[PDB]
Design a protein around this motif. Sequence first.
Motif: not given
Lengths: 369, 382
Positions: A16, A1, A6, A4, B95, A113, A14
Amino acid sequence: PWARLWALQDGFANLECVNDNYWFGRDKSCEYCFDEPLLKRTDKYRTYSKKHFRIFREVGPKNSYIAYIEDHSGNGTFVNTELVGKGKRRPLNNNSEIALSLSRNKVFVFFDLTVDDQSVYPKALRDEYIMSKTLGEVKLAFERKTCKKVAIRIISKLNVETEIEILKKLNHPCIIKIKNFFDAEDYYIVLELMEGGELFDKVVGNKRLKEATCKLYFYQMLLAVQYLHENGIIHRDLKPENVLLSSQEEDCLIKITDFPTYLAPEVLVAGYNRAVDCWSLGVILFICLSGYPPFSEHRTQVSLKDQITSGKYNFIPEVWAEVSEKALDLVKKLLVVDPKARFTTEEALRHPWLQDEDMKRKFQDLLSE
Amino acid sequence: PWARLWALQDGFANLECVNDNYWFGRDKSCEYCFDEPLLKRTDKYRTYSKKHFRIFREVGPKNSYIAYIEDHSGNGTFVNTELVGKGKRRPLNNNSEIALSLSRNKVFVFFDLTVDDQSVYPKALRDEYIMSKTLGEVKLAFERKTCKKVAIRIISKLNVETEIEILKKLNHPCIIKIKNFFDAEDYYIVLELMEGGELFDKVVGNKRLKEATCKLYFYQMLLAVQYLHENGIIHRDLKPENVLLSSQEEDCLIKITDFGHSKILGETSLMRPTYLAPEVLVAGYNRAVDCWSLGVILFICLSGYPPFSEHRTQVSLKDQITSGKYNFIPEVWAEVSEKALDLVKKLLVVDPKARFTTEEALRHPWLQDEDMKRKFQDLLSE
């Protein structure tokens, strides 16, 4: 992952991002399809394209992964107001706002991320340590349990491996400890991390240190260098910023790390002997007591590399007027051009200036911590 | 706004962190209070503490700002499953998932906003470039309009700017173009950025390059160095990692970088392991030092090992170079042409007066090869 998305409006969900590519649009083949019934009645729905835009991850040939957004819409894909443009791409940074058809029509926030991703770092390290900021390749880290700051040197892609063992054997209070070592793929050397920062910051801005304090630090410095020497290590580059202070307090432990002026005279004309470290400590002392360096160019008036060689250091009487004779004398005997004639660490420790049990007792006190 | 908190359950609202400290809990005095009526009926509400936890920013004495979370709850504050613990603190990375009372009970995602913050860089730079990942300080960046990847060398805390303008004057296809410069906070130098990485990575791990390829690269190298020379620049530190390759392909353009050691016109660049010349061990700053270096690069390329290294008491490295007796493994050089070995030989002469020059090297039988020269011309057509 790795990313993200949002959602910022009701119709949208959302996302991922685990896969290397994601298409967005009304077309049923899009990984992220707009065809949802709530989204269909938002009138601005009809302004969205069939293949509106795509976000994707690409390996830049540096072992780094860069996120891109790519506009394919008729009505526009906007990153933080700015229009990408039909057929154009651009890097997609952390906290980017993705807007569709209108500049103000925010739909997603994008988050990278892979920022403080621990997956990069080996398992054995992550169990003891939390990785933090780069201290410019050396990173700040924390002990999982005690939450104590440490520093971690990281190296790159046989023999310079037991060289680490020998450094971990070194045990002196005025010397940085090699707290831990990890060989996974890059070499991770966990080191002590001095809080009080560099001795450099203490003399920066043409200010000098208290003579008593100089003596306290310089004593420690001498001890440390001497220890290094009898442990077959010549420091070879010793300076204000290599000397670290244990706390904010003026009376504190000094610790040495890293195994412009401070180049020795003999090392300018093997010539790799201990005396070079003495020269360096000389220069450190000089800066400490006086608050200015013993050498610097100014103008045509003698080159810096010529100053050192003749041994004629910069002497401002008004400054040295309030520094004891012995202190000046030590510095003198330490900054001899001829290395054979330069003071040694033993000789320096015998010097009248350091014949001071008052501070020596202070030092012992500091060892009780 | 240094941090974002992203709510993951209905009762909770998102939080933008601008202030230096934020308390979370049911107590009305908490900056983030749980007392919301929807949140009050989630049964797990009663498991939350009055002062449950706090997030705060602290200036670490390095001009860096570190985020911390601090658990004060009876039932626990969890960061990515892991329990912080009553009265304990820990760094809060990007995160991070914040869970309350239960390990699995995720409430927030924490995002550091001082990550790829562009505010740090000068406006002049940001107008043209999006800054990206570091490459160790040399960061990647993107031309705003074209999206062309470029490299940006960032430095530190007078006339080191004229030097840049001079290096900018250099205009040869085998020499890294200095695309731009910014004197502000730190000195920013925008450079071309080759897609094929260092010629170093190509010879790393005791592997050698195809002899044909060596010739192609070494020809280019010779041209580049020669050009530099007649433009009053002596490179002074020339090595596998200073030679960059334009693409992944074996047949590609070679480009030279790092004039950080070089002496530009009269002077040494105001920017100021084996590649040290014999004369420079015993002004002694002449062109022939670059030839020596190219010799060493050729040697490494053809053979896949360096001409000098200590091993044991058996002669110091700095003594090997001076006597000129290089390491010669016949089995390796057995499959390298005579002329190739001869060029390297004539290039690694101890006496600099007797060492080959760039012109001489270009006349050498080995480089008398129009087959590869045509290949080179082809590569210029790109």
